[PDB]
Amino acid sequence: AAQKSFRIKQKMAKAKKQNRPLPQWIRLRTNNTIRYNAKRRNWRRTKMNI
Amino acid sequence: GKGTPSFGKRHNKSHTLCNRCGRRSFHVQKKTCSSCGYPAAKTRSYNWGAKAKRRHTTGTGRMRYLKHVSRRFKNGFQTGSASK
Amino acid sequence: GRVIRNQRKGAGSIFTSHTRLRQGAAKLRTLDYAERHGYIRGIVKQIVHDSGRGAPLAKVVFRDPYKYRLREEIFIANEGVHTGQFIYAGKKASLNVGNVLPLGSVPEGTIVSNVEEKPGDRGALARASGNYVIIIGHNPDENKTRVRLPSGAKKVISSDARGVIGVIAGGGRVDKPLLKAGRAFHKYRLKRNSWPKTRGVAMNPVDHPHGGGNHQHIGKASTISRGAVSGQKAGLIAARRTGLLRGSQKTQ
Amino acid sequence: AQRVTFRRRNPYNTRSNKIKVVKTPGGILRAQHVKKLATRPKCGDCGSALQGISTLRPRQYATVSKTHKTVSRAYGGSRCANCVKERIIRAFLIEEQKIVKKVVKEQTE
RNA sequence: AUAUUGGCGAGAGACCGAUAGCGAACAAGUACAGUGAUGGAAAGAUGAAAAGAACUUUGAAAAGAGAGUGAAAAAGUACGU
RNA sequence: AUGGUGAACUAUGCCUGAAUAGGGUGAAGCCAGAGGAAACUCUGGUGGAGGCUCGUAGCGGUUCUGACGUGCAAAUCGAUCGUCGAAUUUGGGUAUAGGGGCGAAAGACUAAUCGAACCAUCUAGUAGCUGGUUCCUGCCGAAGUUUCCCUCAGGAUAGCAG
RNA sequence: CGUGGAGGUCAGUGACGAAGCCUAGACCGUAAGGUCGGGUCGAACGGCCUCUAGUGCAGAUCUUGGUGGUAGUAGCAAAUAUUCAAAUGAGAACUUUGAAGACUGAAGUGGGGAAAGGUUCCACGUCAACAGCAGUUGGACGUGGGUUAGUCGAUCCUAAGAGAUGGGGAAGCUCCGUUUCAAAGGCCUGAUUUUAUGCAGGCCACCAUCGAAAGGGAAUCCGGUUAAGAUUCCGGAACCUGGAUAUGGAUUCUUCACGGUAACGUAACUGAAUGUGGAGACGUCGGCGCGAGCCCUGGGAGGAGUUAUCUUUUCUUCUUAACAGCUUAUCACCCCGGAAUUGGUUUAUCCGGAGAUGGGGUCUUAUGGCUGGAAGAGGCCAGCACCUUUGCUGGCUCCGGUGCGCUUGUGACGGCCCGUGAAAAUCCACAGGAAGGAAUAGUUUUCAUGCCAGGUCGUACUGAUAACCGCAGCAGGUCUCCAAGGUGAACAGCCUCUAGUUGAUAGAAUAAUGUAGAUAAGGGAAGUCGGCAAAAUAGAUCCGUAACUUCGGGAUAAGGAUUGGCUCUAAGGGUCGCGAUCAACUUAGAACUGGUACGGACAAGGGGAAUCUGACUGUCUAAUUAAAACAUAGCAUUGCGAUGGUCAGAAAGUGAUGUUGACGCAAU
RNA sequence: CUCUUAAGGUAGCCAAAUGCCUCGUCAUCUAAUUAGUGACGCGCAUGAAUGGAUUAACGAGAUUCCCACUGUCCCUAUCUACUAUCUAGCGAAACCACAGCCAAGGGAACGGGCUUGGCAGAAUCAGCGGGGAAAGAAGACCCUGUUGAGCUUGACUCUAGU
RNA sequence: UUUACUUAUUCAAUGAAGCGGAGCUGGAAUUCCACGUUCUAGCAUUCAAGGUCCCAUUCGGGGCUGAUCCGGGUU
RNA sequence: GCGUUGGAUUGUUCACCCACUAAUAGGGAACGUGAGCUGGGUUUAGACCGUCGUGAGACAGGUUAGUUUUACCCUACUGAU
RNA sequence: AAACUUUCAACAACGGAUCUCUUGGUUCUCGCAUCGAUGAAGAACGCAGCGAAAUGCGAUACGUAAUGUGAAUUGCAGAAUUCCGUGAAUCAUCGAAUCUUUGAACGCACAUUGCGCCCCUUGGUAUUCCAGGGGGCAUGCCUGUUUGAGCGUCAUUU
Ligand SMILES: [K+]
Ligand SMILES: [K+]
Ligand SMILES: [K+]
Ligand SMILES: [K+]
Ligand SMILES: [Mg+2]
Ligand SMILES: [Mg+2]
Ligand SMILES: [Mg+2]
Ligand SMILES: [Mg+2]
Ligand SMILES: [Mg+2]
Ligand SMILES: [Mg+2]
Ligand SMILES: [Mg+2]
Ligand SMILES: [Mg+2]
Ligand SMILES: [Mg+2]
Ligand SMILES: [Mg+2]
Ligand SMILES: [Mg+2]
Ligand SMILES: [Mg+2]
Ligand SMILES: [Mg+2]
Ligand SMILES: [Mg+2]
Ligand SMILES: [Mg+2]
Ligand SMILES: [Mg+2]
Ligand SMILES: [Mg+2]
Ligand SMILES: [Mg+2]
Ligand SMILES: [Mg+2]
Ligand SMILES: [Mg+2]
Ligand SMILES: [Mg+2]
Ligand SMILES: [Mg+2]
Ligand SMILES: [Mg+2]
Ligand SMILES: [Mg+2]
Ligand SMILES: [Mg+2]
Ligand SMILES: [Mg+2]
Ligand SMILES: [Mg+2]
Ligand SMILES: [Mg+2]
Ligand SMILES: [Mg+2]
Ligand SMILES: [Mg+2]
Ligand SMILES: [Mg+2]
Ligand SMILES: [Mg+2]
Ligand SMILES: [Mg+2]
Ligand SMILES: [Mg+2]
Ligand SMILES: [Mg+2]
Ligand SMILES: [Mg+2]
Ligand SMILES: [Mg+2]
Ligand SMILES: [Mg+2]
Ligand SMILES: [Mg+2]
Ligand SMILES: [Mg+2]
Ligand SMILES: [Mg+2]
Ligand SMILES: [Mg+2]
Ligand SMILES: [Mg+2]
Ligand SMILES: [Mg+2]
Ligand SMILES: [Mg+2]
Ligand SMILES: [Mg+2]
Ligand SMILES: [Mg+2]
Ligand SMILES: [Mg+2]
Ligand SMILES: [Mg+2]
Ligand SMILES: [Mg+2]
Ligand SMILES: [Mg+2]
Ligand SMILES: [Mg+2]
Ligand SMILES: [Mg+2]
Ligand SMILES: [Mg+2]
Ligand SMILES: [Mg+2]
Ligand SMILES: [Mg+2]
Ligand SMILES: [Mg+2]
Ligand SMILES: [Mg+2]
Ligand SMILES: [Mg+2]
Ligand SMILES: [Mg+2]
Ligand SMILES: [Mg+2]
Ligand SMILES: [Mg+2]
Ligand SMILES: [Mg+2]
Ligand SMILES: [Mg+2]
Ligand SMILES: [Mg+2]
Ligand SMILES: [Mg+2]
Ligand SMILES: [Mg+2]
Ligand SMILES: [Mg+2]
Ligand SMILES: [Mg+2]
Ligand SMILES: [Mg+2]
Ligand SMILES: [Mg+2]
Ligand SMILES: [Mg+2]
Ligand SMILES: [Mg+2]
Ligand SMILES: [Mg+2]
Ligand SMILES: [Mg+2]
Ligand SMILES: [Mg+2]
Ligand SMILES: [Mg+2]
Ligand SMILES: [Mg+2]
Ligand SMILES: [Mg+2]
Ligand SMILES: [Mg+2]
Ligand SMILES: [Mg+2]
Ligand SMILES: [Mg+2]
Ligand SMILES: [Mg+2]
Ligand SMILES: [Mg+2]
Ligand SMILES: [Mg+2]
Ligand SMILES: [Mg+2]
Ligand SMILES: [Mg+2]
Ligand SMILES: [Mg+2]
Ligand SMILES: [Mg+2]
Ligand SMILES: [Mg+2]
Ligand SMILES: [Mg+2]
Ligand SMILES: [Mg+2]
Ligand SMILES: [Mg+2]
Ligand SMILES: [Mg+2]
Ligand SMILES: [Mg+2]
Ligand SMILES: [Mg+2]
Ligand SMILES: [Mg+2]
Ligand SMILES: [Zn+2]
Ligand SMILES: [Zn+2]
């Protein structure tokens, strides 16, 4: 809203920090079932619902 | 109206984040979480809501202390040190 | 099958009185030693309009007999009371318009207003604009005063109950046609949510006893027993008679 | 012509969001938010505006000297001169009448 | 002595074998939907070992054609059959 | 049926804010003048009233039964329309919760849900009713009739069949 | 007959290839099926005797998944519109730059915000997917950067309301109630300084708390600066609050100031409890006055454009913040004076022996002027140097006018109400007079100057025909501020300036049928349920206007005429001393003039005579019904005097009406 | 004078948004009127705040006539833009037992198939609305069910309250 | 059935402030009556001055009365 | 074989009348023909009346308002390769 | 005759059936008794050289201490190889600690990272103002302590 509560801003900060692709050195680990970031969020696709 | 034109007026949140459970089920005007019942002392749960109980029950978090209680019992709640 | 409107009124959600702009409860002074034995003189500071009330109110300032300070009271102004007028309240006060006297201290035929039903309730009777109570007699033994109320009822009150000499100001108010739904709207906007009124015969059977039918009609007698229950008391409750009133009032 | 914007986040024309269009030394038009105007202090007896009293918002009176808020008379920045004079005359005459009433009571008994 | 679809620790089965078996064999009460109470998936398998195709060539490139690895590429991560 | 969740839509009250060109008409009040024996009539100005009126923005939604009707859209688009200064429009805050609310009343509205919302559970609710009911071959092989039934699309009973 | 699993057995088959799968190849069985070969493949599996079942599918609008024909089909057609060239690139209708043509046309397609979103902002790299064509571009992808506050908000106040406590109810989850049937208290200080506290002198209370990013409210502006932040950074210049403080000033020998007849003035100029008053603090509409900004316009000092011709011309720059000092109003008030021949006076008719007019004064500082801030800033130019940071050097930034103008602020008024249009925090003042107070000196941080500090959270961007909601990059919906020129009554329509955009898949043809827009001889509703649709009318000025009527209307009734352009004429004003000078539009008339056109586009009533019906304005079936339905004012009936009427609640020491009281509330 | 159960339709108003008969009768309006209007009234079944009669003004209400006006029509024609069309790119859905030429016959009494005839030649494009008893939806009408629900009432059985 | 009593119960108010019974003073016959406020939009608060007694001194402090007593039943 | 009409009233089929005409014959085709239209009537939900019903409501009685969806497939037909 | 259509086969597609796998589920049995104001369960936010998650943890943050084992961890980087050692490890064990903001949740509030009060202390002259650090302040109830209230009430001076 541009006048947001600190709680909201903290949640947005966490969302920004976790808005990234999978680290590439994962997928090199020994067993590594993980293929991609399946929890990736985008502002144009799925809203955080606060 | 009542369909697409009415959905355009939806910009006022009925619920916000709950301090106790963090679910965005804290009704702003009722000042009551629809999910966990905050600020009631008891946590809201119902025996008809078995799935909700399972969602929020013990073991669904990290059990910061309860997870070690069992090992402490197995050792008999000892108090000293291993004493090389 | 549905809770009817008069039933819904009792929950007091949207049917509470709109009291924001009101000046405060219009009450006599608390019945104290000064009024019980002598009199106390106050001053009429303002005569003001009360939202939702036809009669004007008089703000009257008295000295506090026990502490150095002023106490403002909200009387209902009697007609002829003016700002800067000295008001005398008590057993020993004079028989002048605006004074507050015990009912037993005034002669028969006195016109009073804001009359206490019981001594010290600070005014219950003859409070609406233009209304008044008439003192019609005293019974000194077992001290009581017989009075006539605006409705024409005769009431026996304690002789220590107080009233303001005169008639409530603002009389004749209902003589002017409202002339307009908007004027009724603005009248009730400052009283309560009782307007406009949908006729029960214009509703469906679920909504009202009078609802339904291939014609608008009550269907059964609109006179309803006093012993009827909530949801049934629509129409003329416990009516002794109906029809255009032809004859005299004040039944003997 | 140059058009201006609100300088606060309040976008509504409320009583506390009044603006005036001023020209700056940059040669450009800009909104300047204006405080609500002050009401003159008023006589406690008649309600008329008190002569000689500065007209400020309530808390501004804490930032000015006593001279701006008072008048050198028996009721200063509380009652106007005519109301004070009426108080003088009423007090004197009523006290004199009290003396007269007392002596009349004493000489009628 | 009795109860025990919860908790902790164990031993088992003429049980099911990834549309089955718990909803969930997998970052599953997850992703996601709903204002909300709630609702709630899909999704296992290269190969013994990445040895996951050096290098050449065509193409802007993705890629192709060779070459090569491998028991097998009629196993090329769009991977057992 | 039991226990919960909703007034972010909308209905209504409240609290606090905000919004509404330009015209027509020309009410009270007021000024001057004329006629008249008088009583009093009459005239010209002034003024700027009204849930007045034409008509913007707005709010609404009449008709084309126009467009579209696998849509731009689970209600829109165009033209034509009602209304447009008060029972006006509207933001935000607040209150009223399901046999309950709210209703200038249409059984309307109460989150695309209303002649009783939504969610979960009771619940795999019951169904004389509809649909389906999974390999082969061999042998035998019907009934739609009797009686009783709150029975007449069902059953019991006897009969027919293995 | 076949399937999953189990006991037994064939010391069964098998990496020299189990199972599975494919196979118009072979064999057996009537059949369910069984067997073999070939291919594929890779780790298990089978015959027989028995055991056992979640054991056999074509269907159930079956379930889940997958796939077709339809079909390269329907279609990708609203929002006026694109074009040329270059650059980049593998590739350009779509990217970038330039050019051109257009549009939004200030009630924006502009500039900001509120809710919401949450990084979408910005840069670099970059195109697999997404942008229903494309793509080198992007709100995409990858990686990073970015949001700076004592003064702007939150924070604080209370509003409708929400809600603990004390109590009461409820089996209970919990309900009521918000000052109540409560022993509900901190702050002053005599004295104490065995310790400024306990004992102990003495002052105040009918009560938690939450509730507004639009209400209330302490205080900040200008210039510059970034890729992206700015009332936050930088530079300068202020202000408020809290605190600490020392000088100067003031005051005092008549201790707590003087002056003015007064209204009141001031640099100050003691003041506790307690009390009182004010501010905070309030509707709407109408005209009028004033201010600001804008618009229009003259002269001049610059820059630019046009220049065949004309144009002392067209466009553009010429600005001044918060804050501070002096000064400046309407209203209001004071002194003198005593008014009928009543006068003063507003657009609006109010005022005066309760003291007018008049003369002279006082005040509020909205507001304006001058000055400081501050020209050093910003703006506009010119002459220079220029491999960089880029730097200079100078000049000018001046003086007017106008108004039913637009927007906005404000003042004094007036109209309206059975409507009279918040609260609290907070700040000040007054009354009072507790107390403390001076002479090799006391008094005053409401006078000036000086010192210190001002935390926390938000701050980017969009705000919508792509950043919100609507399944989406959806023709829908979603609160608000600013607002140029012309025409014109006008925020209408139409054109333009600033700003922004040029985005909607394209190309080619021009069949039918469509959708949208038009026209039509003669007739003129014969069409049709029905004039549905369309047409006709339309602005303004002048003339003229019926029935009926509640006397207000009907009414723009009806029905006529005129309207361009040009050249003139007349009338309507200010200021100064009849004259001088200055100034803006509105009205009326006349001549002339033309393909008799002229509200020339745009814009813009069809009218009349009646019947039914509802009085009117208003309201509803969001998404098939707008009506005669509902409401309404008016009328009438009903109950009720509070130990009450009507109505809530499971109950309550519980509620609504009720901050009420029959001119009321409640029910029809 | 009576009697049904008290009274017995007054003032008004009407084939009226209330009149069956009914397109009532009379007048008028028209060339012609089941329309309109004005009358009439033993009025199936008008009528007095279940308000009667009337009413100026108002109305996106219903209705008749007239003037103007017109492509509503006689009776059609023409023009513009965007489609449709063709191309590049992009690319769905409904629906689908199997499919798609008829006549008659019989047949579950209206065949694409069966019988008998007629016939019958690849692959197709734009249109089109005869048919596919075309699509859309387990007919909403109707009946049945010992299936409900909303609503009503001296139904049966209860119940808050009082 | 009508009536009394008040402490149960019930209602209401107030910051539970003046209630009940006596008394002093005056008037008039053991009884009765009276027993601080009414031209005026002023003011009314500091244990109240005053009177009196005590102490203790330079500041002053305390008691009584002013303002009757009794019952503690808030009304 | 060929034609068999224009109108007033009514949603109307029917009826009736005016008028022209050679004549204003009768019928069928799913009482032809709604993915051809239209929607006046009938035939949901709004509303009014009268009669009936205690009432909710009823009326083959009157009245007013009331969304008419899809072809691009196959065939048929019209034209075109 | 092609094209087209249809059928079959091969190869290639589409798709993910079948088969074989199985650190999962399901059911049965056996044993055990241990959450929390010493702050639980749950939530929010953080923490790694390079992590978005899962898992672990809490500013001592994929962990500290202790004990055992005895040389790893491993995707890369880095470190170490004395590793005949109080010593690797994402090891096991686990008795000592830490344990942000919360949460029954406790100074008051909470749609605020809002607002107090007390004590000790430090800095700014500073008991009073501002700031930093440390420690505190919920409610009901019980026992006790202390200080009190009531002519409820006893005795005593009187
Ligand atoms: K009824
Ligand atoms: K002053
Ligand atoms: K409009
Ligand atoms: K129902
Ligand atoms: Mg709805
Ligand atoms: Mg809400
Ligand atoms: Mg209230
Ligand atoms: Mg009424
Ligand atoms: Mg009504
Ligand atoms: Mg109705
Ligand atoms: Mg009922
Ligand atoms: Mg009834
Ligand atoms: Mg009806
Ligand atoms: Mg001053
Ligand atoms: Mg599974
Ligand atoms: Mg499988
Ligand atoms: Mg929902
Ligand atoms: Mg697989
Ligand atoms: Mg192989
Ligand atoms: Mg709301
Ligand atoms: Mg109008
Ligand atoms: Mg529309
Ligand atoms: Mg249509
Ligand atoms: Mg279509
Ligand atoms: Mg209905
Ligand atoms: Mg079953
Ligand atoms: Mg046989
Ligand atoms: Mg059957
Ligand atoms: Mg099995
Ligand atoms: Mg094999
Ligand atoms: Mg085959
Ligand atoms: Mg293998
Ligand atoms: Mg089975
Ligand atoms: Mg099958
Ligand atoms: Mg079958
Ligand atoms: Mg199927
Ligand atoms: Mg399927
Ligand atoms: Mg196409
Ligand atoms: Mg289209
Ligand atoms: Mg377009
Ligand atoms: Mg360009
Ligand atoms: Mg335009
Ligand atoms: Mg334009
Ligand atoms: Mg960008
Ligand atoms: Mg694309
Ligand atoms: Mg592409
Ligand atoms: Mg490139
Ligand atoms: Mg990015
Ligand atoms: Mg501020
Ligand atoms: Mg409560
Ligand atoms: Mg608050
Ligand atoms: Mg504010
Ligand atoms: Mg910015
Ligand atoms: Mg600065
Ligand atoms: Mg001086
Ligand atoms: Mg004068
Ligand atoms: Mg404005
Ligand atoms: Mg910003
Ligand atoms: Mg912005
Ligand atoms: Mg914008
Ligand atoms: Mg969206
Ligand atoms: Mg003009
Ligand atoms: Mg024509
Ligand atoms: Mg013509
Ligand atoms: Mg004609
Ligand atoms: Mg006709
Ligand atoms: Mg015809
Ligand atoms: Mg007709
Ligand atoms: Mg029309
Ligand atoms: Mg006319
Ligand atoms: Mg007329
Ligand atoms: Mg009406
Ligand atoms: Mg509708
Ligand atoms: Mg409609
Ligand atoms: Mg009505
Ligand atoms: Mg009659
Ligand atoms: Mg009749
Ligand atoms: Mg008639
Ligand atoms: Mg006709
Ligand atoms: Mg009657
Ligand atoms: Mg009737
Ligand atoms: Mg209307
Ligand atoms: Mg046939
Ligand atoms: Mg036949
Ligand atoms: Mg067929
Ligand atoms: Mg044949
Ligand atoms: Mg053929
Ligand atoms: Mg077609
Ligand atoms: Mg067809
Ligand atoms: Mg059926
Ligand atoms: Mg059905
Ligand atoms: Mg039966
Ligand atoms: Mg039932
Ligand atoms: Mg037919
Ligand atoms: Mg058809
Ligand atoms: Mg049709
Ligand atoms: Mg038809
Ligand atoms: Mg119809
Ligand atoms: Mg109907
Ligand atoms: Mg009846
Ligand atoms: Mg902890
Ligand atoms: Zn919660
Ligand atoms: Zn005064």
Curated annotation (Swiss-Prot), chain A:
Its main location: cytoplasm. The keyword Ribosomal protein applies. One of its GO terms (molecular function) is structural constituent of ribosome. Keywords: Cytoplasm, Ribonucleoprotein, Ribosomal protein. SUPFAM superfamilies: Ribosomal protein L39e. PROSITE patterns: RIBOSOMAL_L39E. Pfam families: Ribosomal_L39. Disulfide bonds: none annotated. It is found in: Cytoplasm. InterPro entries: Ribosomal_eL39 (IPR000077), Ribosomal_eL39_CS (IPR020083), Ribosomal_eL39_dom_sf (IPR023626). Residues 6-19 have a biased composition (Basic residues). Residues 1-21 are annotated as: Disordered. The keyword Ribonucleoprotein applies. One of its GO terms (biological process) is cytoplasmic translation. Component of the ribosome, a large ribonucleoprotein complex responsible for the synthesis of proteins in the cell. The small ribosomal subunit (SSU) binds messenger RNAs (mRNAs) and translates the encoded message by selecting cognate aminoacyl-transfer RNA (tRNA) molecules. The large subunit (LSU) contains the ribosomal catalytic site termed the peptidyl transferase center (PTC), which catalyzes the formation of peptide bonds, thereby polymerizing the amino acids delivered by tRNAs into a polypeptide chain. Belongs to the eukaryotic ribosomal protein eL39 family. Component of the large ribosomal subunit (LSU). Mature yeast ribosomes consist of a small (40S) and a large (60S) subunit. The 40S small subunit contains 1 molecule of ribosomal RNA (18S rRNA) and 33 different proteins (encoded by 57 genes). The large 60S subunit contains 3 rRNA molecules (25S, 5.8S and 5S rRNA) and 46 different proteins (encoded by 81 genes). eL39 interacts with YIH1.
Swiss-Prot record, chain B:
GO terms for biological process: cleavage in ITS2 between 5.8S rRNA and LSU-rRNA of tricistronic rRNA transcript (SSU-rRNA, 5.8S rRNA, LSU-rRNA); cytoplasmic translation. It is found in: Cytoplasm. Binds 1 zinc ion per subunit. This is Large ribosomal subunit protein eL37A. The gene is RPL37A. It comes from Saccharomyces cerevisiae (strain ATCC 204508 / S288c). A zinc finger (C4-type) spans 18-36. Component of the ribosome, a large ribonucleoprotein complex responsible for the synthesis of proteins in the cell. The small ribosomal subunit (SSU) binds messenger RNAs (mRNAs) and translates the encoded message by selecting cognate aminoacyl-transfer RNA (tRNA) molecules. The large subunit (LSU) contains the ribosomal catalytic site termed the peptidyl transferase center (PTC), which catalyzes the formation of peptide bonds, thereby polymerizing the amino acids delivered by tRNAs into a polypeptide chain. Present with 21800 molecules/cell in log phase SD medium. Component of the large ribosomal subunit (LSU). Mature yeast ribosomes consist of a small (40S) and a large (60S) subunit. The 40S small subunit contains 1 molecule of ribosomal RNA (18S rRNA) and 33 different proteins (encoded by 57 genes). The large 60S subunit contains 3 rRNA molecules (25S, 5.8S and 5S rRNA) and 46 different proteins (encoded by 81 genes). Its main location: cytoplasm. One of its GO terms (molecular function) is structural constituent of ribosome.
Swiss-Prot record, chain C:
Coiled coil: none annotated. There is a cross-link at K45, K92, K118, K144 (Glycyl lysine isopeptide (Lys-Gly) (interchain with G-Cter in ubiquitin)). Gene3D superfamilies: 2.30.30.30, Nucleic acid-binding proteins (2.40.50.140), Ribosomal protein L2, domain 3 (4.10.950.10). One of its GO terms (biological process) is cytoplasmic translation. Transmembrane segments: none annotated. It is found in: Cytoplasm. The keyword Ribonucleoprotein applies. Component of the ribosome, a large ribonucleoprotein complex responsible for the synthesis of proteins in the cell. The small ribosomal subunit (SSU) binds messenger RNAs (mRNAs) and translates the encoded message by selecting cognate aminoacyl-transfer RNA (tRNA) molecules. The large subunit (LSU) contains the ribosomal catalytic site termed the peptidyl transferase center (PTC), which catalyzes the formation of peptide bonds, thereby polymerizing the amino acids delivered by tRNAs into a polypeptide chain. There are 2 genes for uL2 in yeast. Component of the large ribosomal subunit (LSU). Mature yeast ribosomes consist of a small (40S) and a large (60S) subunit. The 40S small subunit contains 1 molecule of ribosomal RNA (18S rRNA) and 33 different proteins (encoded by 57 genes). The large 60S subunit contains 3 rRNA molecules (25S, 5.8S and 5S rRNA) and 46 different proteins (encoded by 81 genes). This is Large ribosomal subunit protein uL2A.
Swiss-Prot record, chain D:
Coiled coil: none annotated. GO terms for biological process: cytoplasmic translation; ribosome biogenesis. It is found in: Cytoplasm. Keywords: Cytoplasm, Ribonucleoprotein, Ribosomal protein. InterPro entries: Ribosomal_eL34, Ribosomal_eL34_C_sf, Ribosomal_eL34_CS. GO terms for molecular function: structural constituent of ribosome. Gene3D superfamilies: 6.20.340.10, 6.20.370.70. GO terms for cellular component: cytosol; cytosolic large ribosomal subunit; preribosome, large subunit precursor. Component of the large ribosomal subunit (LSU). Mature yeast ribosomes consist of a small (40S) and a large (60S) subunit. The 40S small subunit contains 1 molecule of ribosomal RNA (18S rRNA) and 33 different proteins (encoded by 57 genes). The large 60S subunit contains 3 rRNA molecules (25S, 5.8S and 5S rRNA) and 46 different proteins (encoded by 81 genes). Belongs to the eukaryotic ribosomal protein eL34 family. Present with 23600 molecules/cell in log phase SD medium. There are 2 genes for eL34 in yeast. This is Large ribosomal subunit protein eL34A. It comes from Saccharomyces cerevisiae (strain ATCC 204508 / S288c) (Baker's yeast).
